[PDB]
Amino acid sequence: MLEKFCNSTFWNSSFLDSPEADLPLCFEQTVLVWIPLGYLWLLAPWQLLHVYKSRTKRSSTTKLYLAKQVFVGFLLILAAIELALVLTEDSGQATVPAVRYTNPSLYLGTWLLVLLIQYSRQWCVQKNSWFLSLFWILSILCGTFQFQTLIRTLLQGDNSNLAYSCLFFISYGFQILILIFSAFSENNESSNNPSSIASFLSSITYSWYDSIILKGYKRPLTLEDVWEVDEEMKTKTLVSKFETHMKRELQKARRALQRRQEVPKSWLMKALFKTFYMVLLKSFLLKLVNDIFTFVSPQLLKLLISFASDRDTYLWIGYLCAILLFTAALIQSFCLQCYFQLCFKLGVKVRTAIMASVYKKALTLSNLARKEYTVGETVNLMSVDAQKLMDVTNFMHMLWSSVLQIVLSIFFLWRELGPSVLAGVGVMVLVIPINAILSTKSKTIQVKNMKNKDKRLKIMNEILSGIKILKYFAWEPSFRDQVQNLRKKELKNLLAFSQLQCVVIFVFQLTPVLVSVVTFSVYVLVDSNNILDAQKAFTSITLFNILRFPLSMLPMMISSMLQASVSTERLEKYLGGDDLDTSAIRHDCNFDKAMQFSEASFTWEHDSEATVRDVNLDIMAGQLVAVIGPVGSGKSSLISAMLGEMENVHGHITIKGTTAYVPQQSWIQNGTIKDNILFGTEFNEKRYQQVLEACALLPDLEMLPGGDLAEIGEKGINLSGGQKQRISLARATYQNLDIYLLDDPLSAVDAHVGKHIFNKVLGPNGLLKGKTRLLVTHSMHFLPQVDEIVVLGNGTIVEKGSYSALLAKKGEFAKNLKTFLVKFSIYLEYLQAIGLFSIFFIILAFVMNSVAFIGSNLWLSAWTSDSKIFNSTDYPASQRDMRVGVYGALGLAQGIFVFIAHFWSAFGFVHASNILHKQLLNNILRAPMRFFDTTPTGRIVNRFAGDISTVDDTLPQSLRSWITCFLGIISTLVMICMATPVFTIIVIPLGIIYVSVQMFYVSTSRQLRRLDSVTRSPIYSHFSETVSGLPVIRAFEHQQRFLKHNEVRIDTNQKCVFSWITSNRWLAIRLELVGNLTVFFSALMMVIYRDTLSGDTVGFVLSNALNITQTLNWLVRMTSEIETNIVAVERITEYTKVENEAPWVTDKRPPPDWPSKGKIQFNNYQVRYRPELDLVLRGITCDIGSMEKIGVVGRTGAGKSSLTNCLFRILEAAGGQIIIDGVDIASIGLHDLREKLTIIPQDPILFSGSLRMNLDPFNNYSDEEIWKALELAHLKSFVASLQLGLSHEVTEAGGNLSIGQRQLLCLGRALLRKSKILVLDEATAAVDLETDNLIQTTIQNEFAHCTVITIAHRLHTIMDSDKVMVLDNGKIIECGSPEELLQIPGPFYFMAKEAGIE
Ligand SMILES: CC(C)CCC[C@@H](C)[C@H]1CC[C@H]2[C@@H]3CC=C4C[C@@H](O)CC[C@]4(C)[C@H]3CC[C@]12C
Ligand SMILES: CC(C)CCC[C@@H](C)[C@H]1CC[C@H]2[C@@H]3CC=C4C[C@@H](O)CC[C@]4(C)[C@H]3CC[C@]12C
Ligand SMILES: CC(C)CCC[C@@H](C)[C@H]1CC[C@H]2[C@@H]3CC=C4C[C@@H](O)CC[C@]4(C)[C@H]3CC[C@]12C
Ligand SMILES: CC(C)CCC[C@@H](C)[C@H]1CC[C@H]2[C@@H]3CC=C4C[C@@H](O)CC[C@]4(C)[C@H]3CC[C@]12C
Ligand SMILES: CC(C)CCC[C@@H](C)[C@H]1CC[C@H]2[C@@H]3CC=C4C[C@@H](O)CC[C@]4(C)[C@H]3CC[C@]12C
């Protein structure tokens, strides 16, 4: 038919079989018009209805809107002129062809539709969308054929359609110009994020990010510069979608588990899939288009090898293949980078949905379920298992895609080499099992090794917390050796893991070499009719390069799916657990009684006895009541049951209004002290200042170094147990609730501040007078002031009444009350730690691999050329066997050098990991005490934890990957320039683009990786903090505040990760385009020089210029990764080079048994705590008698504490000297001093481990010497009770031992040492007077033969010494015997008068 639509031939293949080919005009004017117009009309009705059903308001008019609309107006006018010239010129005189009329008539209809859809677009947020952008591209790429046909016909000299040709040329020019205007963003000027307003072309090329790239280059960037994340991706948006499917599938699985057997599992993957399925479909279609286009380039490669293998194939075929190579690679790059945007965004959305669901569950999980986990083990559920589901979600499409790429590669190989490909398949089926075994083994070693790290870190945290005691006792060598041993076993595992990883990477790298050496050898040896040529060889090498990624990726997805299955069981177990039962505690307000117990019973364990048995009491408003009894009788369980933190056995409790709670064990948040007091409430100056005074807190705030704004918390300044207790009561009293529950808060503070706090805060004269207050006490001191008292016996109420009524009744209380009687030198530091001798041979082995690789490609280029000299009958068998032999030899040679390079490097990186730790630890233990006072302990721990882990884990594999990519690029550029040296002129321009794109990327990505790394840890420390605080958070009803604070943290991290993900999608567009241009210009050189080239050279060049493109990208990715991770070596190096104390042992040795008398002597002494300060102590001058007993005293701030520090040389002397037994303590080695003096520390600390190593970590004393030390300490009767005697184990900080035996055990340690000189610095805190008395008599009984110096804050502790020493302005004022010092009125007498002592 079309022959009489156009009066000319529609198709004739004899137009293409010539040097000057063109298409028939009938084909151009029909099919190449109907393609772009058919795309427009089939979809425009839907695109119009989509806007009509989603419009809100019009945008402003713009210059670009005018400019687009007027040029489509010219397209409409030209279509009218074109129809007018056909309709007037025909004059009815001849039968003009139909096409001459239909085509203009179609264009008139289309330009009216284009004006209409452009007008409709002014309601949308994104103006220039995909729909019109692909119409202009399709129109311009179809019109290009007719453009060259018309201009070539006109240039040949025919003018028969000149006017029509001009109307076409103008219409083609204006479409290119409309496409250029259609590229710009045409902003709404919304400051939120450019990605919502960006055009289709800017979106696919990520050209809306250049605004951050140009910002992060010229100056540092910060969290205010990073765009806020999209509303579809906010934590509230994701959790409210996910929870809808979670509840549905969890309830279904619960019902299925209840239908069986007559916890639920296999529901979390169903809930995730149903939440996100639409993102999976969009990702699948993009990946499938890439997996089609990846097999186009090998077919276009074969055509170019054929075009070089004869010289009468038409010249236009060569240029057309070069254009199609560039075009196919460009379309593939845009699809691939979109697929990655969707996949890496989905992995972040899955993490966010799990982390926020785990957090919200923790606030409501039952007590029986919660006891099954440690705090660190619940934090690992958010830190490890949520991250494992992200790491799998990023790559899961590789499970189907890798199989498809393998099957298509085997098909396109059978087409080139027939049945011989089965010899290559025999290699591919052997390597996949081996990689899955080595990958699951190395993952198993990595998980087992994780336990050793935790043990080392826990010991370190106790070493750095106890460092003052390690210095006093000279114990640093014992704790140094203890850490080193655990490191050795950790390094042994690290070497085995590193060796398994190096053989896995070797097999991934060599498999294309092995499979090609096997396949070409079998093909040539099996049948003498088989002869190898450039088309078969260099095409097959391209398919062997396509196979490398899917063959290595499949084993790693299999071993990762086996890991994520364990993480899924842990998440399903936790999220499926029972919610807390509220039904036994009732909040009926207006109950005319604040609290009411109805025969109730409760327990800590539903299998066990009731801990608070039948109890029946009730209490009215504004009533202060006290709870008392013997130890373990039930006291703190009564408050815990009232809060609902226990299992009900019987009855119920009723409560009226709001509650405040103070626990026996204090909970404190990271923040300022002011933030902990205000606890999310608004500030109000008068009330705030009144609370700080009432809680006796101002005397602490006067001496904390930050004042009221001091950084308290685990990552901040440390506070005493009495300070943490005051702060806890100060928080509770600021909130102003109805009911106060107190779990014996006075138990951690002295009786004088206790009396002050009782009168100010909670007594019938204090702040809380209008509030009902239930007070647990172990002390009797305040009972006379209470409204009503109850005694508990064996979990139930025994007696009740006022204080006087209990004594008048003569109950058991009346007898019991008788108890009241980037710089380059950092890279060089790391290379010297590996050692420069190994760097040389590792680099030499990597270079020899590159030379053997080049040699094997040159040999194959020679081998295929034999096919033009010989034939299937005449090829010599000696030459066949010689060609096969040395190709196998060059295949083996590069296998040997790659194995030597990888396997040697594993010993090099493990050697550096050892040296850096060994030098850090040895410096830190020698640091002076100023370092530990000025530096917060969490900072030092991070260097020993995260940094050491960075240096020994990721760092090594980044350096290996970089040198592998670098030599791959250099090897490839050498082979191209060796084949056609004119290409060296094209290398300079592309090299200037490449180094510029690297410079702009690496300046930004390094900052986003830092900004991610600093903002992630606050999520896990806040989760650890809230899980530790649950009964406090519930008692105040604060759950909604805490949920919002978690959402703010997660959203703040989420934007740093997503903008870093975007930053590497931008990079890839530029570097894949630079890569694509190397193959396009390389292909063109070999078309223009076809007279002096062969199919062998063209195959040799294009084959490895096709694999360059992903290597060009990965070299820049690794450069950013190394520049990020190398900072770990800087931080370690910083502390490795901080200052040290005086030598522990000097040649000047003290004589044998040196402290023989104890003649301590001071001359004009002077000290300051830091070079920045004036002197704390000045001009001290004294002589101390052999075995003399001394007290030191002075007005608070006298500086007394300087003596105990400087006598051990913790502080170095500013002037004067000190002597002991004729030796000056400044000349002797620092351990030879410390080890001879004996000190009892002010505050007891124990190290987690045996009773044996807590008394003697050097294992130097004998078993009976320790038993008599516990006898003299009076602990024998306790230690003999434990199943293990001296081998029994203490937990963290000794927490399984109560405070009485802790203080006593620290006295027992000193008894074993038993030296001639003893220091005592009495503490100013609460103590059990029985333990105080038995310690004080033991001091007088057992150290009778020692010289003794005592420091105390009360004169009744001093008053029986041989001498008293009084100083105030850091200078001596008086000294004498303690009666004579009172006998004449003077400094000490006035004090003793103020103390009531004299
Ligand atoms: C796949 C396309 C887009 C690019 C590859 C080049 C194409 C256009 C080339 C490669 C081989 C060519 C064919 C080779 C031989 C003949 C036989 C002759 O009697 C008619 C032309 C015909 C049938 C050619 C048509 C054009 C052709 C198919
Ligand atoms: C890519 C778009 C924008 C433009 C493409 C235009 C192409 C197809 C045009 C531009 C210049 C044209 C060439 C100009 C001159 C000659 C010389 C003549 O003896 C044969 C045709 C030939 C060789 C033309 C072939 C077609 C041609 C290459
Ligand atoms: C497909 C799109 C993207 C590009 C199309 C390019 C076409 C129009 C180009 C590419 C190669 C060109 C040919 C290259 C060489 C010759 C030989 C010369 O003696 C006459 C022109 C002729 C035959 C050209 C005609 C136009 C041509 C076929
Ligand atoms: C047209 C767009 C899409 C791509 C650009 C292709 C370029 C590189 C192609 C298209 C047309 C080609 C020309 C067409 C015709 C001839 C005449 C011939 O005796 C020498 C080569 C020469 C001079 C070609 C050189 C390369 C050329 C200019
Ligand atoms: C396998 C190992 C032991 C071999 C050692 C490789 C050495 C020579 C390589 C590995 C990583 C490299 C560094 C990686 C990144 C940068 C930042 C860039 O702006 C300048 C070059 C510089 C500083 C490189 C210098 C050379 C380097 C240190």
Residue numbers in the entry: 1 to 262, 305 to 863, 962 to 1538
What do the authors of the reporting publication say about this deposited model?
Multidrug resistance-associated protein 2 (MRP2) is an ATP-powered exporter important for maintaining liver homeostasis and a potential contributor to chemotherapeutic resistance. MRP2 is a single polypeptide comprising of an N-terminal transmembrane domain (TMD0) and the canonical transporter core of two transmembrane domains (TMD1 and TMD2) and two nucleotide-binding domains (NBD1 and NBD2). Using cryogenic electron microscopy (cryo-EM), we determine the structures of human MRP2 in three conformational states: an autoinhibited state, a substrate-bound pre-translocation state, and an ATP-bound post-translocation state.
To understand how substrate is recognized by MRP2 and the effect of substrate binding on the autoinhibitory R domain, we determined the cryo-EM structure of WT MRP2 in the presence of leukotriene C4 (LTC4), a pro-inflammatory signaling molecule that is transported by multiple MRP transporters. Cryo-EM reconstruction obtained in the presence of 40 μM LTC4 revealed the same structure as the auto-inhibited state; only in the presence of 285 μM LTC4 were we able to observe clear density for LTC4 in the substrate-binding site. The cryo-EM map, refined to an overall resolution of 2.75 Å, shows no density for the R domain, indicating that the R domain is flexible in this conformation. These results suggest that only at sufficiently high concentrations can the substrate displace the R domain to be transported. LTC4 binds at the interface of the two TM bundles, triggering a global conformational change that brings the two halves of the transporter core closer together. The inward-swing of the NBDs originates at the substrate-binding site, where TM helix 6, 8, 16, and 17 move towards each other and the side chains of F591 and W1254 reposition to contact LTC4. In MRP2, LTC4 is largely stabilized by hydrogen bonds between the GSH moiety and residues K329, Q447, R1205, and R1257. Despite the high resolution of the cryo-EM map and clear density for the GSH moiety, density for the lipid tail is mostly absent except for a short portion stabilized by van der Waals interactions with W1254. In MRP2, the corresponding residue to Y440 is, in fact, a phenylalanine (F437), mirroring the Y440F variant of MRP1. Substrate displaces the R domain, permitting conformational changes necessary for transport.
